[PDB]
């Protein structure tokens, strides 16, 4: 309906939402995903070493 | 494939490293043979020659 207080409160819980997902969700799945594309993209590196 | 190809890389060099090992063992033999015979025909002929 109109302008209220509401606005800070929405603010404040934004705020920390947003922490509370950069440390604890983000690094922590990229760093799977990662992880798991190195132990993959290295399974190359035989047949760019040993056949070599 | 890793394991694979590393056996025949770490296996090589000991077979063709005996094989080079065997053929300088047998030219060997033929040299020491052939000093050996030159000297039955240094005595066979020089009999020959007397007996002349």
């Known amino acids: 309906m109109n302008l209220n207080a509401t606005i800070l409160g929405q603010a404040i819980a934004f705020v920390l939402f947003v922490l509370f997902a950069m440390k604890y969700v983000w690094p922590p799945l990229m760093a799977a995903i990662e992880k798991r594309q190195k132990e993959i993209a290295d399974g190359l590196a035989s047949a760019e070493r040993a056949h070599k | ?52």
């Open chain 2, 1 to 52: 494939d890793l394991d694979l190809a590393k056996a025949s890389a770490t296996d090589q060099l000991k077979k063709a490293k005996a094989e080079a090992q065997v053929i300088i063992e047998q030219a060997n033999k033929r040299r020491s043979q052939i000093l050996d015979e030159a000297k039955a025909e240094a005595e066979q002929e020089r009999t020959k020659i007397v007996a002349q």
